[PDB]
Amino acid sequence: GTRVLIVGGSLVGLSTAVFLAHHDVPVTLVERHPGTSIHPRAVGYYPRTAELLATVGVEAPAKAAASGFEKHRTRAGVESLAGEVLFSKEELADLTPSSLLLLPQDRLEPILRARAEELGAELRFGAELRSFTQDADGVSAVVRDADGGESVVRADYLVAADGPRSTVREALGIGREGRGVLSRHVSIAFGADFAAVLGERRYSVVHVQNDRVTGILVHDDTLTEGTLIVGYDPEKGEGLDDFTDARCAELVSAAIGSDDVAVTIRSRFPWDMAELVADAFVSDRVLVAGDAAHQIPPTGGYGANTGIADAFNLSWKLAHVLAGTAGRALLDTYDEERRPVGLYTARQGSLQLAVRSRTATEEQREAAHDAMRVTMGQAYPSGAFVADAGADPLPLTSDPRTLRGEPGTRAPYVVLERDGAPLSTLDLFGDGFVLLVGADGGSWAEAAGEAAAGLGVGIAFHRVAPDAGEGRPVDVHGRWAEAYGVGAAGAVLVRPDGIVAWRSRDGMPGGAGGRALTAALRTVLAR
């Protein structure tokens, strides 16, 4: 009945549901909580992440849900929101059609929830994975519902999106490396009349510091929902269980600094700033994604972004394995591609935490990469692609403006037109294998036909040429070939996740194009 089980219906579990259901994979997701968390959590989604979301219709609604917060331009440090202000302060179109999506997770998640439900994913909230076993043939998972009733869900594969304390990762005996837990915090979600204390003021985030509370205070677009994130010191013997609703009300009220503002605590969650990365992201039929794979220090919001990229990477791979078009070893490439990225990003988070706390060495500041290089400039060291002979390999990240369609990299953004209507290379990707070809590369259509037929996998052919053709992509400014690092007679095979899989810099005479592409694609699909 149900073929991929996801554990966790936070960001990554749901990005997984949307991506698997996009690819016509039967998904059951389980989330122990009765819905998606009202806490804001990770608030910035970088252009690359937005592009990923574009492929499943999530960018436009998320951009719409984000304009409410676009006004929230001011960062400040205060004694209390009602008290004294101590301090207050206030991509680009050749690379990406997307901008930074300033949207809290509690707004992005319901969008992903809706889209997953539309694409036919089964989402069981208030449902807890107790334990699981895996054999040669699949995975058997014990689910306890809200009523306390248990059942065994049978799946081909299990995706662990169950967060930092992932009982799956632990059940599998996958350890973790990194600098570990830096600080322990509690997120306190509450309802309050922010307007009555804000006036015309709108903040992104407020640092609160007075005798009774230190912490990070956020308000939503509506000025009704707020979060207070506070430290606790286990050296003082403080823990989570000290954050009783009494205690939570007292902190929030001292952060507001009013008394007259009625506060309703909705929930507190524990939240650690940590650098901890799984040794392995794949254990036979279990795929570890998200905070379960990589706790990342939150400065730059790399965690939530990395985890959606995890979900995007593994999703089509599972779809290809489940449909018998890819060898089971295709999934191993999830680990090969995303673990180095996971580990690199987690360390990037630590550099940023160090640069922001003003405790970085010039070496930490030297090694800290632009967020666009971290999220868009990735060159997978190895995985589901075929490298170019002779062309020197890329490091893990580069300036994404220097990338020219090297296999293992984001197939570049090239502005096109179809019947006068704007488009890009990116609009072409996300649904299946895409073969793109230059002006002189008309023969590569037969090439795509042969490989598609030979291997039983769809290959959407598009020639990119600088003069019209009704319903044909027009290379408006004649950039495609240069941008993809091929001649006008060349071809570039793009994976479902928009990563370049293979290319021919030159044309291939006769059947050679078809034989080569078949072998290229046979390798990427582990066949």
Ligand SMILES: Cc1cc2nc3c(=O)[nH]c(=O)nc-3n(C[C@H](O)[C@H](O)[C@H](O)COP(=O)(O)OP(=O)(O)OC[C@H]3O[C@@H](n4cnc5c(N)ncnc54)[C@H](O)[C@@H]3O)c2cc1C
């Ligand atoms: C309170 C809090 C505040 C945060 N604040 C920030 C922030 O300010 N900045 C930032 O960059 N990141 C922040 N994060 C982290 C961010 O939310 C994650 O990086 C992002 O959501 C990716 O995590 P994930 O979806 O993989 O896992 P998580 O977000 O941890 O979600 C894991 C989910 O798995 C579920 N689960 C666990 N065990 C089971 C089980 N047995 N059965 C079913 N479901 C299970 C949990 O209930 C949870 O919903 C915060 C997280 C929390 C919890």
Ligand SMILES: COc1cc(=O)c2c(=O)c3c(c(=O)c=2c1=O)=C(O)[C@]1(O)c2c(cc4cc(C)oc(=O)c4c2O)CC[C@]1(O)C=3O
């Ligand atoms: C020592 O110095 C620090 C240490 C930290 O450990 C730290 C930290 O951990 C931070 C943080 C910090 O400033 C610091 C910080 O100074 C925030 O600034 C933060 O990014 C943030 C939040 C919400 C929003 C909402 C909106 C719309 O837009 C934002 O711009 C926005 C955010 O940007 C919620 C908290 C946040 O995610 C975060 O975790």
